[PDB]
Symmetry: C2
Subunit: 71 residues, 2 copies
């Protein structure tokens, strides 16, 4: 768990968490009630993703976030 500085970095880290637990986009989507396509857009093109989508996906991954010093 490290500091995250961009949407791309964020999406890559969460995608890795998804893969490391062997979850599919479809099963995560079903779990929180959004489209599989929405998870695919977030993983690939996270820049315009809504905060609401990010939080729903975070919950699906059994994750949360905290703020920290940029340093």
């Amino acid at each position: 768990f490290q500091k995250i500085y961009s949407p791309t970095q964020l999406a890559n880290a969460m995608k890795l968490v998804r893969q490391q637990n062997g979850w599919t986009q479809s099963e995560l989507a079903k779990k929180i009630g959004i489209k599989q396509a929405t998870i695919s857009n977030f993983e690939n093109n996270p820049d315009n993703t809504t905060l609401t989508t990010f939080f729903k996906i975070l919950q699906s991954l059994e994750l949360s976030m905290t703020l920290c010093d940029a340093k």
Copy 2:
């Protein structure tokens, strides 16, 4: 620095950091080059706010984020 679970909670936490440092929306917006209106929409209505905006505002605040376990 607490676990954050929603856009509102995130926006409230970041607004608080802005105020605790005595920073105005205008000076943050000018610092990273976005609209003052954009920071205002984020603070009040964060749900559909983009990941790009959220990250720009974090940088303006000298903040970063980290993922963690949801518990």
